[PDB]
Structure 1
Amino acid sequence: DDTSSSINFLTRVTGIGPSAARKLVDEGIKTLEDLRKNEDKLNHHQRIGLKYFEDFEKRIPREEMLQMQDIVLNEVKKLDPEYIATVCGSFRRGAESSGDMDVLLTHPNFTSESSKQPKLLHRVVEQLQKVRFITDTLSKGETKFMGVCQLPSENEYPHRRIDIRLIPKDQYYCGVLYFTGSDIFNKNMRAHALEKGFTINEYTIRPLGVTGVAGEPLPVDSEQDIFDYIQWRYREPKDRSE
């Protein structure tokens, strides 16, 4: 009803999940100002999302996304040029406007074998905060940071969501691809791959075998390599709609 209408609104809040939205309703929380008068029942996450609800509603225009990409890119370099950083998502794909900033990151020091180098990620983030770019944090793991950011006003920009993922270097390309999408693109590709006797996921590419249940990840030093495994011409990001 006009109330379910409430669970619907809430959920429109980054952090506000359903079961998470649900309870707040049993607490008498329905509208937003309801929320502002009730930070205390909210986590840090939900809290931030509420804090920026509006801005979060806006799309990011590629002119913006661009500068955003320059900043993140030139900072990560100054820390350690052995650092690899790829802004994925629809934008990578030429998209005109984007929802958020999805940053993929890796380092030679870090591989799927190590599995423990928080500092690697942390470091960058820190660097950005210092820069005044990242502005808040919703969540922050050893391998994945999710937060807020904002272009440097010279006078002001909205706050954009931004994500960072630390990927082991030997799994990174499968990753860029995967995070590059579209979803169809991926679906089709995984479908083809299958024909070719290959299994693909956001992490690896693995030859199959009898009965089908098989694997043993092949080496990937670039996206191209994937296309090569399954011997398909290489599609640049743009021609990736499907």
Structure 2
Amino acid sequence: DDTSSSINFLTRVTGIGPSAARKLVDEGIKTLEDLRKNEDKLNHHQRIGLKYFEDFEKRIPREEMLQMQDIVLNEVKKLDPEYIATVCGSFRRGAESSGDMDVLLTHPNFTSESSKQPKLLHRVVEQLQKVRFITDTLSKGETKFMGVCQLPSENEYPHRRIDIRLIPKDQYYCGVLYFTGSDIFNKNMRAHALEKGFTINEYTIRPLGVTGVAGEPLPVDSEQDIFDYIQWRYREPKDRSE
């Protein structure tokens, strides 16, 4: 229906999922003039999404990502040069434009054994907000932050989505690799490993055993190591299309 048409639209709102879009249509909330008017029935996230509906439909150009990643790397370095920050996504692969920013972050103090340190992530969010790069928050957990940022003007940029994830240092590389993609690439490399007697997921790489259902993480200090384990020439992110 021209109304099903409505759920389609809604769901284009960050924060607004289906079940969630369904109901607002029962409340008779379809256009977003509807929504604007009715902030009271939306959560913080949905509201933020609504707030930058437009801006969020815009794609990010490399030049912008470049600058964005520098603010981010620069600032985290100031807090503690021992922090490792990596901007992933197609961007890392050379992409000419992007849809949002995905920052993977880590620290040697934080390992999968530790597993418990929000301040580690909060400290940086805070610093980014203080710099005024991060302008809003959608949601913010102990290990993941979803928000909005904006390059500063001097005279305007649209608001963009940014995500910061804090991963244990011991799973960081698998993670970066993983979030680096592409999808196919990932698929192709998992396939191979397997052929090599290993199973790789976004956090680990473990040797298989007989019967299959086997494991025990091998240490990884770099992306290179994963490729060594299955003995593949290392592929620079740029050669990661498939």
Distance 1:207 1:238 in 2: 27
User: Aligned-pair distance for 1:24?
Assistant: 0.3
Offset from partner CA, 1:77-131 (integer Å, 9 cap, x none)? 0000000000000000000000000000000000000111000000000000000
Deviation per CA, 1:153-207: give whole Å up to 9, x if none: 0100000000000000000000000000000000000000000000000000000
Which secondary structure does the structure 2 equivalent of 1:170 belong to?
helix
Q: CA deviation at 1:67?
A: 0.3
Q: TM-score, normalised by structure 2?
A: 1.00
State the alpha-carbon separation in 2 of the partners of residues 49 and 37 from structure 1: 14
Give the Cα–Cα distance (whole angstroms) in 2 for the partners of residues 210 and 185 of structure 1. 26
Question: How much has 1:10 moved relative to structure 2?
Answer: 0.1
Partners in 2 of 1:121 and 1:28 — Cα distance?
40
Aligned partner of residue 47 in structure 1, secondary structure: helix
- Residues 48-67 of structure 1, C-alpha deviations (whole Å, 9 max, x = no match): 00000000000000000000
Q: Measure, in 1, the Cα distance between the counterparts of 2:225 and 2:95.
A: 24
Q: How far, CA to CA, are the matches of 2:73 and 2:61 in structure 1?
A: 18
Q: What displacement does 1:20 show?
A: 0.4
- Normalization by structure 1: what TM-score? 1.00
C-alpha distance in 1 between matches for 2:238 and 2:188: 15
CA distance in 2, matches of 1:29, 1:74: 43
Taking the aligned partners of 1:155 and 1:37, their CA distance within structure 2 comes to: 31
Shift of 1:240: 0.1
Gap runs ≥5 in structure 1: none
SS of 2:53's equivalent?
Answer: helix
Q: CA deviation at 1:26?
A: 0.4
In the alignment, the residues of structure 2 paired with residue 156 and residue 209 of structure 1 have an alpha-carbon distance, to the nearest angstrom, of 56
1:208 positional shift: 0.3
Where does the alignment leave 5 or more consecutive residues of structure 2 unmatched?
A: none
Partners in 1 of 2:16 and 2:32 — Cα distance?
A: 12
**Cα distance in 1 for residues equivalent to 2:101 and 2:19:** 27
CA distance in 2 between partners of 1:64 and 1:28 (Å)? 39
State how far apart, in whole Å, the 1-side matches of 2:70 and 2:213 are: 43
SS at match of 2:125: helix
1:134-160 CA deviation, whole Å, 9 max, x = no partner? 000000000000000000001000000
Alignment of 1:125-204 (within 5 A): 125-204=125-204
* 1:24-83 superposed Cα distances (whole Å, 9 cap, x missing partner): 000010000000010000000000000000000000000000000000000000000000
CA RMSD of aligned residues (A): 0.3
How many positions carry a matched residue from both structures? Answer: 242
Residues in 2 aligned to 1:199 and 1:175: alpha-carbon distance in whole angstroms: 14
1:163 match: secondary structure: strand
Distance in 1 of aligned mates of 2:37 and 2:49: 15
Task: For residue 212 of structure 1, give the secondary structure of its aligned residue in structure 2.
Answer: coil
Secondary structure of the residue aligned to 2:170 is coil
> Aligned-pair distance for 1:212?
0.6
- Find the counterpart in structure 2 of residue 81 from structure 1: 81
SS in 2 for 1:188: helix
Residue in 2 that maps onto 1:64: 64
Shift of 1:218: 0.2
Task: Quote the Cα distance in structure 1 between the aligned partners of 2:148 and 2:48.
Answer: 9
